[PDB]
Amino acid sequence: SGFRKMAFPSGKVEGCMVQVTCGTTTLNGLWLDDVVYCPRHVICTSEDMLNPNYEDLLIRKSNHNFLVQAGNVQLRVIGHSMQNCVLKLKVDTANPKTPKYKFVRIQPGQTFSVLACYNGSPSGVYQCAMRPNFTIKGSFLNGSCGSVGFNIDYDCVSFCYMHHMELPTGVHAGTDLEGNFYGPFVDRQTAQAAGTDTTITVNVLAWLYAAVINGDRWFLNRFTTTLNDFNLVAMKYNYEPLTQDHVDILGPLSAQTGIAVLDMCASLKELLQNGMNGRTILGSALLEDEFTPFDVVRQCSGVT
Amino acid sequence: SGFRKMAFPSGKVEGCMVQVTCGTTTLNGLWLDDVVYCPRHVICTSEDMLNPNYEDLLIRKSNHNFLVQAGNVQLRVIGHSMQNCVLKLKVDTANPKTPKYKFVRIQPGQTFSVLACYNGSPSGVYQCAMRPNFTIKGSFLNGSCGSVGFNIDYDCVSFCYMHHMELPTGVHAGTDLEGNFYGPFVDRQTAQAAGTDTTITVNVLAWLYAAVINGDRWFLNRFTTTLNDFNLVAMKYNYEPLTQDHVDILGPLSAQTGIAVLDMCASLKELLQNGMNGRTILGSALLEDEFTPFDVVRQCSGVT
Numbered sequence: 310s311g312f313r314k315m316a317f318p319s320g321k322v323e324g325c326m327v328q329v330t331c332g333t334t335t336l337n338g339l340w341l342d343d344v345v346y347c348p349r350h351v352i353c354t355s356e357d358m359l360n361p362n363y364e365d366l367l368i369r370k371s372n373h374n375f376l377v378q379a380g381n382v383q384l385r386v387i388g389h390s391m392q393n394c395v396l397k398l399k400v401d402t403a404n405p406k407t408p409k410y411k412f413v414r415i416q417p418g419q420t421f422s423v424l425a426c427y428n429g430s431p432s433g434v435y436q437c438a439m440r441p442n443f444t445i446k447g448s449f450l451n452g453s454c455g456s457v458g459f460n461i462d463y464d465c466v467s468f469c470y471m472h473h474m475e476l477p478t479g480v481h482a483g484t485d486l487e488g489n490f491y492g493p494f495v496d497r498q499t500a501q502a503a504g505t506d507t508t509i510t511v512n513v514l515a516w517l518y519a520a521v522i523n524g525d526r527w528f529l530n531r532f533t534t535t536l537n538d539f540n541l542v543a544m545k546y547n548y549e550p551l552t553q554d555h556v557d558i559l560g561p562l563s564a565q566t567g568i569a570v571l572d573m574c575a576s577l578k579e580l581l582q583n584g585m586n587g588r589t590i591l592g593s594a595l596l597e598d599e600f601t602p603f604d605v606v607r608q609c610s611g612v613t
Numbered sequence: 614s615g616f617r618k619m620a621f622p623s624g625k626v627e628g629c630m631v632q633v634t635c636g637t638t639t640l641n642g643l644w645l646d647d648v649v650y651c652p653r654h655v656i657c658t659s660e661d662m663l664n665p666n667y668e669d670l671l672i673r674k675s676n677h678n679f680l681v682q683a684g685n686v687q688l689r690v691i692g693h694s695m696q697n698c699v700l701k702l703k704v705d706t707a708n709p710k711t712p713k714y715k716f717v718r719i720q721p722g723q724t725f726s727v728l729a730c731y732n733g734s735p736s737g738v739y740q741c742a743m744r745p746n747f748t749i750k751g752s753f754l755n756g757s758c759g760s761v762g763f764n765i766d767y768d769c770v771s772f773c774y775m776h777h778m779e780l781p782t783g784v785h786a787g788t789d790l791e792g793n794f795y796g797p798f799v800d801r802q803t804a805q806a807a808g809t810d811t812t813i814t815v816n817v818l819a820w821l822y823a824a825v826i827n828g829d830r831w832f833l834n835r836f837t838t839t840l841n842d843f844n845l846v847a848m849k850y851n852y853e854p855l856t857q858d859h860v861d862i863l864g865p866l867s868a869q870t871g872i873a874v875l876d877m878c879a880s881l882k883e884l885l886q887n888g889m890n891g892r893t894i895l896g897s898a899l900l901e902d903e904f905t906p907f908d909v910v911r912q913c914s915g916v917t
């Protein structure tokens with residue numbers, strides 16, 4: 310027992326991290342096969358970022374201007390192309406540590422692990438979620454750009470995120486590995502405010518099921534509710550609407566605990582209306598929303 | 614910016630995880646050089662655990678009874694010895710993935726990363742702390758025994774913990790890599806209750822400094838206090854006493870923010886006395902104590 314914000318083991322991704330330098334800008338790249346993926350803003354100066362014309366800036370760059378270093382050894386760049394907001398640097402050597410991989414574009418509410426890197430070197434790993442406003446609440450400093458988000462299914466790493474920027478509000482924005490930003494963010498240093506950061510309701514319910522599985526049952530009440538009634542309360546508290554799809558995804562957790570999904574919704578409804586009253590659930594004084602129902606099942610069953 | 618419960622990259626430790634089986638018990642081992650370290654309770658049945666005589670149980674075991682598997686390949690056991698509560702299985706092959714390593718016995722309040730494993734395979738990585746009552750609040754299921762806690766300093770992995778058991782209260786107990794349990798716990802299925810789980814005061818102050826560095830300043834007040842006055846309040850709230858050593862360790866964070874350590878103690882004192890009032894600090898509704906001052910500096914400076 311015990312429930313922790315657990316990240317995937319990062320070894321498979323550590324073997325893909327490289328340093329990319331263009332001019333005076335150095336950030337991280339992801340080396341898969343003979344291609345190094347990195348944010349296209351590597352070609353920019355801090356001044357360029359105010360109003361960059363990436364196509365024009367890229368015309369002034371050649372293969373030899375992209376310095377790619379894997380460990381202490383230099384990789385030879387034999388091609389370069391811009392795909393949306395990422396650059397793909399074709400190198401003459403396939404990464405011998407390339408794992409089985411996929412590029413996936415995740416949905417808001419979905420969680421992933423981030424391997425924060427600086428100068429192509431991993432500094433740490435943490436678990437986060439794609440917020441409903443398409444930002445991530447990560448931990449990134451200058452130089453962390455190019456750090457990636459991923460999930461692992463046994464031996465296949467599914468890359469979902471590449472870090473590009475920090476908004477003036479301390480939240481983070483990035484792309485999938487095809488270079489498309491999550492949300493409406495652009496790689497330009499301009500006025501970009503995030504939308505409402507709503508709570509991922511299905512994740513909170515999954516975490517309430519994890520709490521019951523791990524012994525924290527004080528919040529279980531004698532009530533039930535309906536999806537419509539629950540959703541009136543969820544709207545009032547800036548919680549995402551709960552759908553029948555979400556109820557269905559919670560089915561295995563509902564079956565394991567013997568607590569019907571709508572009964573747990575009534576528990577959540579009372580927690581929203583009355584607060585925790587100075588009490589905690591799984592060592593937290595707030596309702597955790599960065600564990601999906603899949604994460605709760607995975608952690609409670611020990612999938613390796 | 615942003616502050617996350619960050620674990621070290623686990624790749625270096627993933628390359629050391631092996632499966633050890635003795636009879637019908639299978640748990641994890643740590644393979645460093647030509648030695649596999651694992652909990653000595655691998656020789657026990659669930660019945661044996663009630664009152665095990667490890668020396669007597671070990672007499673009935675030979676080298677060939679310890680099945681060590683690294684990936685899908687079997688390791689040949691050429692020696693076995695019991696050191697305190699761990700077994701050291703000498704194998705005929707040095708682990709080619711052995712990193713630079715040390716075995717350290719940590720103090721309470723110190724943090725480390727855990728790579729949770731099952732059948733020698735890593736399932737996840739999370740950050741935790743050695744509690745002042747010598748337990749850890751981890752996430753371990755049956756089969757997780759032998760999973761290790763560690764810190765990394767650039768390229769040297771310092772192993773500090775090996776998982777052995779879960780107490781009836783859902784908290785975890787284990788040893789250092791010399792086989793000595795942290796605290797008064799024994800590898801016997803008997804009445805073992807943990808002592809007071811006090812809050813690691815120096816860590817809370819470090820995390821309050823991280824909050825100021827990352828923009829959360831609402832809790833900063835117009836007051837100061839003394840170590841003696843602060844400690845009267847800390848005792849009342851089951852917080853560890855703050856010493857001059859702790860003040861000294863907080864010096865670099867105090868210098869970076871320009872907030873004297875005792876002023877932050879007064880902030881913490883008001884937070885203890887008045888509560889958060891429905892507010893949060895770094896997205897938490899309680900005072901986080903599982904980041905050391907070293908962790909805060911490391912995360913805020915990006916040490917790789």
Ligand SMILES: CN(C)c1ccc(N(Cc2ccsc2)C(=O)Cn2nnc3ccccc32)cc1
Pocket residue numbers: 334350351352353354355358449450451452453454473474475476495496497498499614
């Ligand atoms: C010189 N170039 C290449 C460059 C200059 C600025 C940046 N920006 C600013 C920005 C804002 C909107 S568009 C660009 C980042 O946010 C980068 N960033 N990512 N995470 C960070 C954590 C802290 C500080 C910085 C951070 C990226 C690249």
Ligand SMILES: CN(C)c1ccc(N(Cc2ccsc2)C(=O)Cn2nnc3ccccc32)cc1
Pocket residue numbers: 310638654655656657658659662753754755756757758777778779780799800801802803
């Ligand atoms: C059959 N053998 C070898 C064996 C049998 C029992 C155990 N015990 C029980 C115990 C309590 C005090 S002394 C032994 C564990 O706690 C093991 N453990 N570790 N973490 C876990 C998370 C969940 C469930 C089990 C867990 C270990 C080994």
